[PDB]
Amino acid sequence: NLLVTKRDGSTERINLDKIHRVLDAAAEGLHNVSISQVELRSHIQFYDGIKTSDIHETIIKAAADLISRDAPDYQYLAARLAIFHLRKKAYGQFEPPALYDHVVKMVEMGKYDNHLLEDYTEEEFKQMDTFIDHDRDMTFSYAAVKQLEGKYLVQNRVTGEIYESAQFLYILVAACLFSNYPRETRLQYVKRFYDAVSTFKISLPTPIMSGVRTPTRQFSSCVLIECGDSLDSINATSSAIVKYVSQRAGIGINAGRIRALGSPIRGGEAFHTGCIPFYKHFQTAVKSCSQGGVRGGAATLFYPMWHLEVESLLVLKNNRGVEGNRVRHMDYGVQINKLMYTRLLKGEDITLFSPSDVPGLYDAFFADQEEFERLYTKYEKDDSIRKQRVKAVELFSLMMQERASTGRIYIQNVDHCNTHSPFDPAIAPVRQSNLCLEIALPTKPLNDVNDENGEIALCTLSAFNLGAINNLDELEELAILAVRALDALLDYQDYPIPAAKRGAMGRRTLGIGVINFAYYLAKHGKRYSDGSANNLTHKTFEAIQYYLLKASNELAKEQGACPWFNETTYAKGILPIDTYKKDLDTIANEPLHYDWEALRESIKTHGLRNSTLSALMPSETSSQISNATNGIEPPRGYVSIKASKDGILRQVVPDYEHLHDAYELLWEMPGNDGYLQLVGIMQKFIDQSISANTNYDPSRFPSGKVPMQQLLKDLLTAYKFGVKTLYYQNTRD
Amino acid sequence: QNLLVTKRDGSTERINLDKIHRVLDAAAEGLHNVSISQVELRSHIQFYDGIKTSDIHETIIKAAADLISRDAPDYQYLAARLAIFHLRKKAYGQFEPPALYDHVVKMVEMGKYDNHLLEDYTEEEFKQMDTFIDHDRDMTFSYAAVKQLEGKYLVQNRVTGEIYESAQFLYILVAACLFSNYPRETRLQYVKRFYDAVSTFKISLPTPIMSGVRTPTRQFSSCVLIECGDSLDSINATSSAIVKYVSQRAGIGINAGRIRALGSPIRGGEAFHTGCIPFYKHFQTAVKSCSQGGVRGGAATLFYPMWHLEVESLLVLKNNRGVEGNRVRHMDYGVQINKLMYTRLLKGEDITLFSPSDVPGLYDAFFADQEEFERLYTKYEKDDSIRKQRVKAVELFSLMMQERASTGRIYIQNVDHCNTHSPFDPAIAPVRQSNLCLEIALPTKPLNDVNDENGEIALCTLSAFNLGAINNLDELEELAILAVRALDALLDYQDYPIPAAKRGAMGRRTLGIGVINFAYYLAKHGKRYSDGSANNLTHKTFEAIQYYLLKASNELAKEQGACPWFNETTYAKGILPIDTYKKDLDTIANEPLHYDWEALRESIKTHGLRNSTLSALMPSETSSQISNATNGIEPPRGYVSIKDGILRQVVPDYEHLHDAYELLWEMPGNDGYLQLVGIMQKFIDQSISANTNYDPSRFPSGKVPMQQLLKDLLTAYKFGVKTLYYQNTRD
Ligand SMILES: Nc1ncnc2c1ncn2[C@@H]1O[C@H](COP(=O)(O)OP(=O)(O)OP(=O)(O)O)[C@@H](O)[C@H]1O
Ligand SMILES: Nc1ncnc2c1ncn2[C@@H]1O[C@H](COP(=O)(O)OP(=O)(O)OP(=O)(O)O)[C@@H](O)[C@H]1O
Ligand SMILES: Nc1ncnc2c1ncn2[C@@H]1O[C@H](COP(=O)(O)OP(=O)(O)OP(=O)(O)O)[C@@H](O)[C@H]1O
Ligand SMILES: Nc1ncnc2c1ncn2[C@@H]1O[C@H](COP(=O)(O)OP(=O)(O)OP(=O)(O)O)[C@@H](O)[C@H]1O
Ligand SMILES: Nc1ncnc2c1ncn2[C@@H]1O[C@H](COP(=O)(O)OP(=O)(O)OP(=O)(O)O)[C@@H](O)[C@H]1O
Ligand SMILES: Nc1ncnc2c1ncn2[C@@H]1O[C@H](COP(=O)(O)OP(=O)(O)OP(=O)(O)O)[C@@H](O)[C@H]1O
Ligand SMILES: Nc1ccn([C@@H]2O[C@H](COP(=O)(O)OP(=O)(O)O)[C@@H](O)[C@H]2O)c(=O)n1
Ligand SMILES: Nc1ccn([C@@H]2O[C@H](COP(=O)(O)OP(=O)(O)O)[C@@H](O)[C@H]2O)c(=O)n1
Ligand SMILES: [Mg+2]
Ligand SMILES: [Mg+2]
Ligand SMILES: [Mg+2]
Ligand SMILES: [Mg+2]
């Protein structure tokens, strides 16, 4: 005699057969799943007059809780049930409308960009509708669908109303990005690109997934802003942060130029009150807005190791201090070079300077290591220059201690970023990184928010799904599609800050990485830790960079090289294979299989459409769409528990049934050596950097505490193999 | 063995107590009831072998300063002169200052003085200005004055600590700079007259003028008012202007009430608005990012309407019982209230809260049109389609007064009073905010960029009349001419880092001239604050002040032209403050107008005013110490006030007036004080930094009841009080 409340507000007798019908449809083709089990977990929570939507959410939750090693197919059962509900939420029915009718209505509501109706005819929308396979929504895993409804699908962030479905997302991303292409080839690209992303061969980032089709055009994930030593630059930097955080971007801030506490201002008219009060101002700029209504804003701030306030800056995330000297809600990257490590190894002292007191030292730190060492030792001997001496061991230990405590103190090897780089340090040095330490681009400080002479670096991302290819030669066509889409995006999107448009239009920097690398190694029967994957990694990432360059080179023939191509090492006929750190020759003997010399000349002759092409991002969120292992990281477990706005999610490794023994889980590794070696080998070909993690299990160490010696050893090992940056440090609980 | 001292050059010589004694005799000349032996004994015991001669001098300064008392007040002059002696050595290497011209040349060469001085004046003119100077006026400072001189005002290295000048050089060059664009026929006559006025303490100058005017950095406006719009572009523009102006000696008043509430849709729902508090935090770090020109810390007051949707969250931002996520403690706040809000309180009704983005026209009418506000308010209160929240008026007001009592830093602005009794036409240029210390009330316009030419930032330049230095009220005629001319010339002389600020300054040319030594003034007339015995005297006094201020600015309009936007003032329509004051004042004062305001009215309507505003009563907490004045209109805490460390300051003429003063905690309540404020406000163009005071021990169970807090609040409104500054609670 129990009643349920329908969508129209009316009530009718409960019908358990209707629910069974829906469960049957979602369980089609699945193995080792039980409808009864979901029913048992669901029926008990029903009550008189329960809303029909609350019933649907109950059975989704019930199926999601049953995701396990014994029955992994619950990941599709839970996903499909969620898909069913999302259809009702968006369309009021299961079957999606015609694409054209959908677009017209959505443009009328102001949810889609007007250009869609201007750039495509009704005939073309009907033709694009034939490209769409809505049954591909039944190929998602549960974690994927939660990211879709939570972040990616176009929706009202106040109401919660869903406006679209996954395949409309995919086709309109493709339609918008190729909207400026000639009608002779346009739809052919739209279809090819739609297939590539909807069948998970190419992975798209969050701001593209949630942005490309909306009236707000900003799809770059990474924004790099260099701050100058003036109030005008600090104000400009702060404004650019607020504007770009609110428009879907994560921020990298370089504030190393700012003079130290106690420095004179205007000849001594003022006493400099320090960097920390300005860091706080950058922090509130980041936390002032949400990231385009999708997630919270975040930033990583960079400063040199030899900065005079470095001992104060290193403990900014430490919870044991007053608010006066704590800036906890930002991450930090300490910038290091060969000389600093040398002082550590020789057990010597490091001299701290304010960049305002040492002419030329800051610039040489990134561009010229010989000049740096000349100026550094010269200023160390100058009594007239304000300075402070610290033991290198104590300084490094403090850094690694804070890195261990928080996990969010990062390292950037600035010499590696410039000796092995797509840029000439004498023309455009790399002086910072981004939020997740995989981006390395040239920048220039601003004197105003609208300063035409400043440069903010933008990087637009994507990733190759290494688990979705049978041969490395598939990367060629995939690279062409990826490069063309991201490069066309640069002309398509808008730029709230003029200095950012400068860097984007001048360099056209792309950052394309990989996902499902752990799955990839598992299929080849290799491991992270023992070194069995060294040569396979070398072979694999050679193919990736080669086809990326080849695609960008061909696109230069068609549309012209980027305006500032002559500032690259590529322009001088220098390739990544020429400048890598030679210690890599001791850990890999895989030969080059592709014709780089023919490629070298073609680049030297026609140039590149893009100054950078590769960067290995963590893909923490975006990789969940294809149920991939994120980036290059090994999974935590066969069934991982990840975070979400709704609650906890269970995510299964791809093909657990056949590869349960093939995977090497994160905490099954003896140490970081094997991992750091793979990262170094990757870096040989990667244009920018890699979001490299370090991992430590306290229980594997005596007295349950990781010795400082081990931390410093892995740090030096990373530098030895040319690793440019270090991201998270994970400490097991 | 013999005890040695270390000289300045690093050498040593046998200690000579006679040298110290001789220095003490020079500083004690003409003083009474002081003992050199007392100072020497306290100093000698702290001496040690090889003691630096400069540490010797600092010791005898401390010794004299510790003997400052009611019994022997002249130690305040003993300690000061000793401090002046030492400051001479630091700046010149000797007691006697160099010739003015040689000093200026060297300081310009060192980059400590502005280049224009050597361009605008000849060597002959500097030698002539040197004849105006009386360096012996340095011996007329009190100790607190000299501590502010060496600490904040004298040109010095903020990293080194090196002093570069003395007080009379400060005074002569402030005058020389401000009148530097004057015709040579009258220029040096203005320089001498103005130098005499400030060095003999007739006119009091504010901190950024005292520490700024002669330096290469030209920004001397004390108050900067920035209105923020509901957009990121405006928020970014506001943040930039704050950082720039704090760094250049200014205090900030922020209007952030237009910002839509937490939960509001953005771009039709593309985003969820995360609230005002994260932006308030961004403003706080902007204020605290810089020092104020190297002199003191940055500070700001932020303003919002009482009917804002987040008002309950905004009111507790200084409350120390919360996580950092919803606490912005290092800023002050001004709650904006009007008649309709008070009515709901008195009637025991509800107040409806809105986000200004959801109530078209309500925010503007809140300041400009009380009739239209009530129409829109009641209309929107019944609209179900409009997001809203209802709160009992009693509970909302109690929360506000609770946080005001706990912190002392939650302020009140009666926005209707600020626009019905104003030099500005609310239909053209409404007053929508105040400043840091709640005495400034000027028009603003939000910016869309830091370089936006269509925005308006309000700047106010300050000064004060020393009421304890005048013999008759007609001496204000001369002093007003000097004060107005100096501040008006300053506007063309100084620079403007933000274009929107230059717009308001050049367009309205708003000045804020107040008073100091008011407590000393009442004491000389045998009046008190509390009983109402000074109501008519206050009326008579502040009538003369505003009249002579308007008259000075009216004459200045004839000579140089009225301000560009004079047409936006009530003065332009022939309306005077004596026409628009709150009528309840007629019940607490029957003093007639002694000056010809009708003749002035005709003159203003014809020739205009050089300045849109002229009067504002600032607290003058720092600047008043220079003349050893009682600060502003506030009564002293004691005969010896304790304000490097601790300072002792004696009220002027303690010997003859110890019985005439009425100390702060000798008062029954705030009624007598609030009536004086209301009477003052009748003539004041802008507002007054009005304090409320409470002694818990006078109340049952040692706690001031909310009913009493609300009574004083309503009393202030009753008498047309525009703003409320500090609430002081006795310990
Ligand atoms: N009478 C019912 N008794 C039990 N479950 C029901 C009943 N009607 C619908 N459900 C279940 O509720 C869930 C949500 O279905 P649905 O979104 O179609 O709700 P609805 O009220 O039927 O909507 P509409 O009337 O627009 O079709 C489904 O799992 C469906 O099987
Ligand atoms: N052909 C289908 N294949 C898969 N899922 C479907 C199909 N048709 C409908 N669904 C989904 O199943 C759920 C229930 O659909 P539907 O409203 O038709 O049934 P019901 O609500 O149980 O019954 P009714 O609403 O007619 O009382 C919805 O979430 C809908 O999107
Ligand atoms: N009042 C202040 N308080 C604290 N820091 C300040 C202040 N003014 C400027 N700074 C800092 O001093 C540095 C220089 O400031 P800025 O360049 O804008 O002024 P400037 O006139 O060029 O002086 P300088 O010639 O010394 O550089 C910057 O790091 C800025 O943040
Ligand atoms: N991502 C964001 N997170 C939080 N607050 C935001 C964000 N973007 C904008 N805001 C706030 O929303 C308000 C409106 O923003 P703004 O005017 O700059 O953008 P807009 O495109 O004009 O949007 P709208 O048309 O809704 O006004 C401002 O108060 C601003 O601070
Ligand atoms: N030999 C001394 N013994 C004791 N007190 C002294 C001696 N010389 C100076 N003083 C006192 O020290 C204080 C500081 O005086 P002053 O600045 O002139 O020091 P100084 O070393 O004598 O400098 P300078 O050489 O420039 O005259 C004064 O009170 C002075 O009387
Ligand atoms: N004529 C004066 N009137 C008042 N104070 C003076 C006079 N001459 C000097 N002083 C002050 O007295 C202090 C001491 O002056 P001065 O250096 O000449 O004497 P001293 O330090 O005691 O002895 P010494 O000759 O060893 O320096 C200084 O602070 C100086 O400014
Ligand atoms: N929570 C996050 C995650 C990523 N990012 C940005 O996205 C870049 C790559 O991160 P990612 O590949 O994990 O991001 P997703 O696109 O996978 O969400 C980083 O450099 C950040 O700039 C961010 O701003 N905020
Ligand atoms: N600590 C202070 C005090 C005052 N002020 C500014 O000075 C104005 C009047 O204060 P005041 O007259 O007490 O300042 P002084 O000139 O006496 O130092 C206020 O409106 C503030 O804008 C400031 O910026 N910082
Ligand atoms: Mg139904
Ligand atoms: Mg500078
Ligand atoms: Mg001496
Ligand atoms: Mg807007």
What is the per-residue DSSP string for A288-341? Answer: TSEETTTEE--EEEEEETTBTTHHHHTTTT-SSS-GGG--TTSEEEEEE-HHHH
Record: contact B450-A285, CB cut-off 8 A? no
Count other Cβ atoms within 10 Å, centred on residue B349. 13
Record: contact A111-B268, CB cut-off 8 A? yes
Record: contact B158-A449, CB cut-off 8 A? no
Domain ranges for chain A: 200-634+669-733
For ligand 7, what atom is nearest to the CA of residue A439?
20
Tell whether ligand 8 has an atom less than 6 A from the beta carbon of residue B295: no
Count other Cβ atoms within 10 Å, centred on residue B665. 14
The CA-based diameter of chain A, rounded to the nearest angstrom, is 92
Token pair of A732, please? 């097991």
Closest CA to A608 of A653, A665, A550, A681: A550
Experimentally, how was this structure solved? X-ray
At CB < 8 Å, which residues of chain A contact B? 110-111, 156-159, 214-216, 231, 234-235, 238-239, 242-243, 246, 262-271, 273, 277-278, 280-281, 283-285, 287-290, 292-293, 323, 448-450
CA distances (Å), origin A65, targets A625, A648, A653 = 19, 9, 16
Helices B277-287 and B232-247, interaxial angle, to 10°? 20
Record: contact B236-A449, CB cut-off 8 A? yes
Residues of B within 8 A of A111 (CB-CB) are 268
A520: which DSSP letter? H
Find how far residue A539's CA is from the centre of its chain.
24
Closest CA to B550 of B487, B617, B585, B601: B601
A205 Cβ contact partners less than 8 Å away, ≥ 6 residues apart: A219, A221, A460, A461, A462, A463, A617, A619, A622
Closest CA to A156 of A236, A208, A235, A90: A90
- Quote the ligand 8 centre to B618 CA distance (angstroms): 7
A373 Cβ contact partners less than 8 Å away, ≥ 6 residues apart: A339
B275 close to B312: Cβ distance less than 8 angstroms: no
Nearest CA to ligand 4 atom 4: A289
- Quote the ligand 11 centre to B12 CA distance (angstroms): 12
> H-type helices in A110-253, by residue range?
115-119, 122-129, 142-147, 166-177, 186-198, 206-211, 231-245
Tell me the sheet residues that pair with B302: B254, B333
Mutating which of B215, B240, B279 best tests the A interface, going by the most A Cβ atoms within 10 A? B240
Across A489-637, where does the E strand assignment appear? 510-515
A402 Cβ contact partners less than 8 Å away, ≥ 6 residues apart: A314, A315, A317, A318, A409
CA distances (Å), origin A471, targets A203, A544, A613, A707, B381 = 18, 12, 21, 43, 68
B247: which DSSP letter? H
Q: What is chain A's alpha carbon radius of gyration, rounded to the nearest angstrom?
A: 26
Closest residue, chain B, to A236 (C-alpha): B240
B304 close to B352: Cβ distance less than 8 angstroms: no
Dihedral, A383, A387, A388, A390 alpha carbons, nearest 10: -90
> H-type helices in B369-452, by residue range?
370-381, 393-407, 417-420
Question: Rounded to an integer, what distance in angstroms lies between the CA atom of residue B715 and that of residue B710?
Answer: 9
Residues of B within 8 A of A270 (CB-CB) are 158, 247, 291, 293-294
Record: contact A157-B289, CB cut-off 8 A? no
Helices A16-26 and A52-65, interaxial angle, to 10°? 50
Q: How many CB pairs under 8 A join A and B?
A: 131
What is the length of chain A? 733
What is the length of chain B? 731
Nearest CA to ligand 1 atom 31: A19
B338 Cβ contact partners less than 8 Å away, ≥ 6 residues apart: B366, B370, B373, B414, B415, B416
Question: Rounded to an integer, what distance in angstroms lies between the CA atom of residue B701 and that of residue B697?
Answer: 8
Find how far residue B51's CA is from the centre of its chain.
42
Question: Rounded to an integer, what distance in angstroms lies between the CA atom of residue A555 and that of residue A559?
Answer: 6
Three-state DSSP class for residue A467: coil
B194 close to B481: Cβ distance less than 8 angstroms: no
- Quote the ligand 9 centre to A56 CA distance (angstroms): 10
Token pair of B370, please? 């009380």
A337 close to A365: Cβ distance less than 8 angstroms: yes
Tell whether ligand 2 has an atom less than 6 A from the beta carbon of residue A94: yes
A611 close to A494: Cβ distance less than 8 angstroms: no
Question: Rounded to an integer, what distance in angstroms lies between the CA atom of residue A498 and that of residue B212?
Answer: 36
| SS3 letters across B537-569 | HHHHHHHHHHHHHHHHHHHHHHHHCCCCCHHHE
Is A554 labeled as catalytic in the residue annotation? no
Question: Rounded to an integer, what distance in angstroms lies between the CA atom of residue B379 and that of residue B361?
Answer: 12
Dihedral, B43, B47, B51, B56 alpha carbons, nearest 10: 0
Q: Are β-strands A510-515 and A457-465 bridged in parallel, bridged antiparallel, or unpaired?
A: parallel
Question: Rounded to an integer, what distance in angstroms lies between the CA atom of residue B78 and that of residue B317?
Answer: 46
Selecting from 3.20.70.20, 3.40.47.10, 1.10.150.20, 3.40.50.720, what CATH number does the domain A200-634+669-733 have? 3.20.70.20
Element (H, E) at B479: helix B476-493
Residues of A within 8 A of B293 (CB-CB) are 269-270
Token pair of B396, please? 């909302």
Record: contact A158-B272, CB cut-off 8 A? yes
Q: Half-sphere exposure of A503 toward its Cβ, with a 13 Å CA cutoff?
A: 30
Resolution in Å, one decimal, please. Answer: 2.6
B239 close to B246: Cβ distance less than 8 angstroms: no
Residues of A within 8 A of B249 (CB-CB) are none
Is A470 labeled as catalytic in the residue annotation? no
Element (H, E) at A465: strand A457-465
